[PDB]
Amino acid sequence: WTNTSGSCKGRCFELQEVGPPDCRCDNLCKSYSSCCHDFDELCLKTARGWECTKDRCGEVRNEENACHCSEDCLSRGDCCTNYQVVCKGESHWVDDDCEEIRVPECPAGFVRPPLIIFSVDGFRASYMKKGSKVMPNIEKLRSCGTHAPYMRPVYPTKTFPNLYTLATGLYPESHGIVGNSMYDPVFDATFHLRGREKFNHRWWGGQPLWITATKQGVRAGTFFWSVSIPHERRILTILQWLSLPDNERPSVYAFYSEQPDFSGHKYGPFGPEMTNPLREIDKTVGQLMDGLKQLKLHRCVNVIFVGDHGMEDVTCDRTEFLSNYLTNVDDITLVPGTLGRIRPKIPNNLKYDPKAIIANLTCKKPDQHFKPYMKQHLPKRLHYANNRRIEDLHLLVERRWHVARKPLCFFQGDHGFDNKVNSMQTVFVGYGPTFKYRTKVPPFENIELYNVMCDLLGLKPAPNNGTHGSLNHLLRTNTFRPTLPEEVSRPNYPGIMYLQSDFDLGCTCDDKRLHTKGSTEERHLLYGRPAVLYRTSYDILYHTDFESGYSEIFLMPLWTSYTISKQAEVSSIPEHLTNCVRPDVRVSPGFSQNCLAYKNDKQMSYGFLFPPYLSSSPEAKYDAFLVTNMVPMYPAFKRVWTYFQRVLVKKYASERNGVNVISGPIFDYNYNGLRDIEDEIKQYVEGSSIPVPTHYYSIITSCLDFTQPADKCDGPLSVSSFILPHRPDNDESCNSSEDESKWVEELMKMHTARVRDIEHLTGLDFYRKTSRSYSEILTLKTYLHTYE
Ligand SMILES: *[C@@H]1O[C@H](CO)[C@@H](O[C@@H]2O[C@H](CO)[C@@H](O[C@@H]3O[C@H](CO[C@H]4O[C@H](CO)[C@@H](O)[C@H](O[C@H]5O[C@H](CO)[C@@H](O)[C@H](O)[C@@H]5O[C@H]5O[C@H](CO)[C@@H](O)[C@H](O)[C@@H]5O)[C@@H]4O)[C@@H](O)[C@H](O)[C@@H]3O)[C@H](O)[C@H]2NC(C)=O)[C@H](O)[C@H]1NC(C)=O
Ligand SMILES: CCCCCCCC/C=C/CCCCCCCC(=O)OC[C@@H](O)COP(=O)(O)O
Ligand SMILES: *[C@@H]1O[C@H](CO)[C@@H](O[C@@H]2O[C@H](CO)[C@@H](O)[C@H](O)[C@H]2NC(C)=O)[C@H](O)[C@H]1NC(C)=O
Ligand SMILES: *[C@@H]1O[C@H](CO)[C@@H](O[C@@H]2O[C@H](CO)[C@@H](O)[C@H](O)[C@H]2NC(C)=O)[C@H](O)[C@H]1NC(C)=O
Ligand SMILES: [Ca+2]
Ligand SMILES: [K+]
Ligand code: NA
Ligand SMILES: [Zn+2]
Ligand SMILES: [Zn+2]
Numbered sequence: 048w049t050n051t052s053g054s055c056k057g058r059c060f061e062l063q064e065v066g067p068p069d070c071r072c073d074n075l076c077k078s079y080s081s082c083c084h085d086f087d088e089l090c091l092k093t094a095r096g097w098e099c100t101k102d103r104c105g106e107v108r109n110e111e112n113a114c115h116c117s118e119d120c121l122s123r124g125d126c127c128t129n130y131q132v133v134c135k136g137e138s139h140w141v142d143d144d145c146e147e148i149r150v151p152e153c154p155a156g157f158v159r160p161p162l163i164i165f166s167v168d169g170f171r172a173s174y175m176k177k178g179s180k181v182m183p184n185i186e187k188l189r190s191c192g193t194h195a196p197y198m199r200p201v202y203p204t205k206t207f208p209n210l211y212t213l214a215t216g217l218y219p220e221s222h223g224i225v226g227n228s229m230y231d232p233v234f235d236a237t238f239h240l241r242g243r244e245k246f247n248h249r250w251w252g253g254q255p256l257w258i259t260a261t262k263q264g265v266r267a268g269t270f271f272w273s274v275s276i277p278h279e280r281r282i283l284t285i286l287q288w289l290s291l292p293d294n295e296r297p298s299v300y301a302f303y304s305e306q307p308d309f310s311g312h313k314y315g316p317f318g319p320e321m322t323n324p325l326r327e328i329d330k331t332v333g334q335l336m337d338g339l340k341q342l343k344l345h346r347c348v349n350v351i352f353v354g355d356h357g358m359e360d361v362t363c364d365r366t367e368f369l370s371n372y373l374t375n376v377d378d379i380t381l382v383p384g385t386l387g388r389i390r391p392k393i394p395n396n397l398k399y400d401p402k403a404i405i406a407n408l409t410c411k412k413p414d415q416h417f418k419p420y421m422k423q424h425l426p427k428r429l430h431y432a433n434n435r436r437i438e439d440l441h442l443l444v445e446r447r448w449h450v451a452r453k454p455l456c457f458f459q460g461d462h463g464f465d466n467k468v469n470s471m472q473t474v475f476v477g478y479g480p481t482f483k484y485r486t487k488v489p490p491f492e493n494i495e496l497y498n499v500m501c502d503l504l505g506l507k508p509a510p511n512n513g514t515h516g517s518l519n520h521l522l523r524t525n526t527f528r529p530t531l532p533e534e535v536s537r538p539n540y541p542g543i544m545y546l547q548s549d550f551d552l553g554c555t556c557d558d559k560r561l562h563t564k565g566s567t568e569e570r571h572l573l574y575g576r577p578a579v580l581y582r583t584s585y586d587i588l589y590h591t592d593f594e595s596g597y598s599e600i601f602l603m604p605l606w607t608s609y610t611i612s613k614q615a616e617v618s619s620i621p622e623h624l625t626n627c628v629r630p631d632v633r634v635s636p637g638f639s640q641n642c643l644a645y646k647n648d649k650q651m652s653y654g655f656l657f658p659p660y661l662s663s664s665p666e667a668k669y670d671a672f673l674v675t676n677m678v679p680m681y682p683a684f685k686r687v688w689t690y691f692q693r694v695l696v697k698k699y700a701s702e703r704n705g706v707n708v709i710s711g712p713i714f715d716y717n718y719n720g721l722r723d724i725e726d727e728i729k730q731y732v733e734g735s736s737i738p739v740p741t742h743y744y745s746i747i748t749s750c751l752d753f754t755q756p757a758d759k760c761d762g763p764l765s766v767s768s769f770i771l772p773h774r775p776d777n778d779e780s781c782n783s784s785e786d787e788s789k790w791v792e793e794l795m796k797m798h799t800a801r802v803r804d805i806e807h808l809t810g811l812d813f814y815r816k817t818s819r820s821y822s823e824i825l826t827l828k829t830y831l832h833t834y835e
Contacts, residue, residue: 049081058083059090060284062268062295074284077273079246097279097334099127104134114283121341124290125283128338140336140345141184145191149523151480153347156293160480161348162503163285164301165335166213167328168206169308169462170354171316172197172472174325181322182329184336185476188352191485192478193521199492199831200356200473202429202466203386206308207240209355209493214270215253216497216511218430220437220720223252228382229436232394254509256500260299263506268300278304278331286338299504302335304328311358315459316470349481349503353496354473356462359446361385363456367416367444370453372407379404381452385463387417387442401440408442410781416448423718424779426798427742427770427808428831429466430512432718446470467799467833483523491518491829502527514803517825529821532812534578538587538596540564541633550636553643554674556627564589571609573707573758574748575816579605581722588633590670593657599638600725602737603678606711606811607656610758611700617693620659624672628653631675639674640737648733650775654680656710658692678712679732679739681775687794688743688771690787695795696747703749703765705757712740713770713808722810742770744805746813763819767832770800770808802828 048068055072065071067081072090076082092113095103099116108117113127116134120126131137151160175194179186201212201219207227208219219225227240231250238245257267268288272281285300307324314320332352339345370376378396382388391399401421408419420441422432431437444450446468449461464471472490481503498515501508502525508515516529567589568576577596579585585598585605593609628642645653655676662668670676680688699706714723716730730739746768750760771794777783782790802813806828814824 051082051084053083055083055086055089059086060269060287062266062288062297074269074273074276074281075271077275078271091276091280093277097127097283099130099133101133113279124287124342126338126341128282128286128334128341131341132337137340139333140340141187141333145187145485146346147484148346148480151347154343156296157347159298159505160503161289161297161344162299162351162500163335163348164213164299164351164353164500165332166210166301166303167307167352167354167474168303168305169311169356169358170328170474171311171357171470172354172474173316173357174307174321175474177322177325181325182332184329184332185352188332188350188478189476192350192476193482193484193486193488194476195488195490197472197490198353198475199490200354200466200471201493202431203463204356204466204468204471205385205463206355210303211251211253211255213353213355213493213496214255214257216494216508216513217253218494218512220430220432220434221253221512223250223434223436225431225434225436226382226386226388230380230390230394230438231436233435235394253511256299256497259501259506259509260504265299265504265506266295266297268297270301272303274305278302279334282331282334282338285335286342289339289342289344299500302331304331308358311460311462312458313460315360315362316358317360318459346480349477349479351496351500352474352476352478353493354475356473357471358460358462359385359464359468359470360459361447361449361461362459365416365447366449366451368451368453369408372411373404376452379452381450382438383451384449385444385461387419387440387444387450388438389440389442390438405440409778415781416445417442417450418779418781420779423741424772424774426800427715427720427804428798428800430720433720467831467835469835477521481522481525483521486521488518488521489826489830492831495829498527514825514829516822517829519822520826526822529825531815531821532578532580534812535581536579536583536585538576538579538585541586541588543632545630545632545635547630547632549632550630550639552630552636552639552641552674553646554628554630554641556629556672557623558621558627562589562633567591567594570758571707573610573760574764574814576608577606577709578812578815579810580812581810586634588631588675590657591667592661592663592670593676595656595676597634597675599634601712601714602638602640604656604675604711605809606709607676608707608709609657609661610705610707611661611696612705612758613700613703613756615661615697615700615705617660617697618662618665618668620668621665624659624668627672628674628677629669629672631673634675640677640732641735642674644732644735644737645679650681651679651732651739652682652685653677654685654688655692658696660693661696678743679737680743681773683776684743684771684773686777686783686787687791690791691745691795694788695792699747699749703747703757704753704755705749707748707757708745709748709813710743710745711809713742713744713805714738715741715808720804720807722808740773742772742808744768744770744800744809746802746805761818763823764814764817764827766802766827766830768800768802768805769795769798770804771795771798796834799832799834801831 053070058072070083103116211224310324495513498513519526595604595607659671749757751763
């Protein structure tokens with residue numbers, strides 16, 4: 048119980064913690080219904096609006112006004128933001144020329160540049176193109192500070208998961224806010240964007256920026272605003288807090304606007320109606336900057352202007368209905384719209400038949416505008432599986448479409464789609480002493496920002512999913528010096544130690560300083576050997592055409608590395624070598640796979656990491672058939688892999704002036720995005736202990752300067768990578784009955800990945816020996832080739 052009888056006298060938007068029975072006056076009291084009786088009265092004044100007029104200058108201070116234009120207002124810290132322009136002949140901030148801020152220029156008492164995070168909801172990256180004609184203040188921030196062309200949100204591309212990701216540096220599967228709405232089967236409770244349950248702390252994982260700041264003795268302003276508090280008041284409040292005594296003043300502030308999201312939904316992203324809300328946001332930004340200038344803080348504070356996600360054209364006419372596919376949709380609950388999550392209407396309902404449901408949802412219409420996935424099969428780049436609040440059955444919906452349960456309009460826009468979709472990209476601008484001046488940076492992911500905000504505030508970040516240092520290039524100072532992880536397992540270099548006669552593996556090959564190092568490593572291992580960051584036992588193996596790190600535990604390479612010149616020739620597998628597998632005298636029969644298992648497993652076949660198709664000579668091709676180059680592959684997967692090995696790698700070489708390729712297996716049976724330990728592997732080749740990868744990766748590197756060959760690159764690198772799911776069928780690809788040239792690349796693009804993703808999944812550390820800085824390499828590793 049809270050005693051509302053109290054008063055907010057001299058307490059408006061106080062920063063101190065106040066719990067029952069005491070009544071509150073902070074920006075979240077209305078939301079808790081615990082405001083003092085005179086909160087609305089004393090704290091939400093509205094009299095006379097938000098701007099000084101000439102006729103108010105040098106007025107007698109009336110405490111009833113929303114803001115003041117009286118001569119004392121500056122000391123009290125509650126002038127209207129335009130007071131000086133209207134009353135003291137100053138200029139708006141926007142009208143001032145841009146000037147580089149080389150060091151913070153802060154008033155007496157300021158020890159560090161405050162950080163103000165200005166978040167806008169549903170601000171599509173492309174809105175920035177509207178420029179100073181529509182958004183002059185924002186355009187000044189963008190052009191004079193540091194900007195990316197866009198920032199990638201997390202999936203699903205909705206507000207709650209993204210704002211909390213910004214605050215924590217975590218994927219939703221880790222922070223727990225996996226949707227605007229979600230059901231937790233252990234709580235047996237439902238979280239809704241609107242409603243009381245969301246206020247319970249049990250839902251919120253990780254450690255958000257305000258807690259991190261607080262725990263390290265840095266004071267945070269509010270990161271929540273009651274919907275009823277108008278934007279102009281949020282701005283006046285932040286400015287008031289910045290005018291506080293040195294011993295009360297916060298170091299970090301957040302502003303939030305629900306626009307242009309609301310108008311985007313109503314009118315669509317390209318609607319002429321979008322101009323007004325964009326003008327209004329820019330006006331708010333100008334109030335903030337005018338206010339800061341008034342406080343002599345405009346060259347002191349760091350400002351981040353940042354969106355949570357974009358906005359797409361979506362209308363009523365583009366809705367798929369599950370009732371068209373399924374006989375009884377009244378028995379399921381669907382989280383609908385721009386994504387789908389399906390569970391039984393009755394929790395744990397035993398009659399729920401997910402295999403039959405998925406069957407009926409799989410490639411049933413030629414133009415089907417969604418695709419069902421068991422969550423473990425979703426592209427790994429989405430990182431959207433390892434949480435109990437994520438339903439097993441998911442629908443990835445096509446951009447511009449909705450999925451609904453059944454047919455039983457006022458919107459032209461929505462968002463929530465796959466986070467690589469162009470329309471979902473959002474905005475990032477940093478402006479202030481700590482950011483660079485007039486600098487553009489490549490697009491990056493919102494998970495990276497928490498580390499940077501910690502850097503900007505002198506905080507040590509809690510464990511998170513950013514890669515600390517990957518965004519050092521945004522900053523003039525306060526960069527984070529990263530440190531190369533130490534290798535845990537050194538390799539063995541096995542020489543010959545066995546004779547063909549030592550092997551009883553069931554392999555047959557109907558035909559018949561070798562494997563010494565130089566110069567294999569300098570040709571095929573361009574950026575150093577991957578460091579193995581876990582305890583295990585493996586061998587380096589050299590070959591004319593490729594090098595590998597062969598695991599004696601998992602009985603196949605952890606990685607296989609090779610270079611293909613632009614000029615390289617593709618060759619066939621000779622008829623007599625079709626089924627050729629050869630034992631490897633370098634590796635004990637006890638640490639080898641046996642072809643008997645393959646011969647005997649009627650569902651599992653095999654493939655090779657280095658493709659015989661790319662052998663340098665008929666002689667060298669024989670290396671490609673070694674048992675130590677072989678991996679277990681379903682025939683379905685082989686359709687994809689052979690096309691990749693025989694057509695695509697060469698195509699990449701030709702297009703990129705040669706490529707270096709590192710390929711290998713990934714084991715993630717528990718779908719947590721991390722290297723499986725032995726205990727967690729659940730499938731082996733029939734009758735054997737050969738483990739079956741859940742995915743196969745390839746990392747393809749070349750010279751950013753394409754005029755230089757990949758093997759002779761003097762500068763920055765270009766990288767594209769994939770994590771392909773290892774599945775017994777191609778049900779994912781609706782056109783897979785056709786020739787591979789019609790569907791394989793489409794599948795690969797969907798499963799594009801960052802090198803960093805592969806690192807988490809393999810426990811390997813790449814690019815350790817290059818001519819680039821460690822920070823540049825971290826940037827390279829977070830890169831995602833999106834194909835948009
Ligand atoms: C993205 O970055 C994050 C953060 O580093 C990584 O997530 C971490 O993974 C490690 C290794 O698996 C886990 O370590 C285990 O920790 C548990 C105990 O963990 C408890 O205490 C910690 C510290 O206070 C707390 O963070 C944990 O919070 C989890 O559980 C909460 C309560 O249920 C929940 O509110 C919160 O959202 C979070 O849930 C998530 O993680 C759990 C697994 O712990 C998972 O089941 C759930 O679905 C969510 O994904 C928890 O109270 C020990 O018992 C183990 O021995 C081991 O030390 C960390 O717990 C985990 N941290 C967080 C915050 O998620 C990701 O791996 C990384 N992803 C990628 C792809 O790199
Ligand atoms: C480190 C911080 C970076 C993030 C800063 C976050 C500031 C968050 C909050 C500020 C003020 C209080 C309210 C915050 C949540 C507002 C949620 C909401 O208003 O969503 C409305 C709507 O759009 C929801 O649906 P979608 O947009 O369709 O997903
Ligand atoms: C709820 O709030 C009011 C205001 O503080 C409390 O009323 C005061 O109670 C004290 C103690 O009896 C009186 O001496 C004061 O004169 C009261 N203040 C005013 C201005 O009315 C009330 O006690 C609180 N309710 C509780 C404590 O349960
Ligand atoms: C999957 O779709 C089929 C239709 O292709 C549904 O089949 C119907 O099933 C009911 C009883 O289950 C029969 O009376 C109808 O004759 C079937 N329709 C047709 C056109 O054959 C099936 O029910 C669907 N399964 C699920 C789980 O929704
Ligand atoms: Ca795992
Ligand atoms: K077989
Ligand atoms: Na198919
Ligand atoms: Zn939003
Ligand atoms: Zn929205």
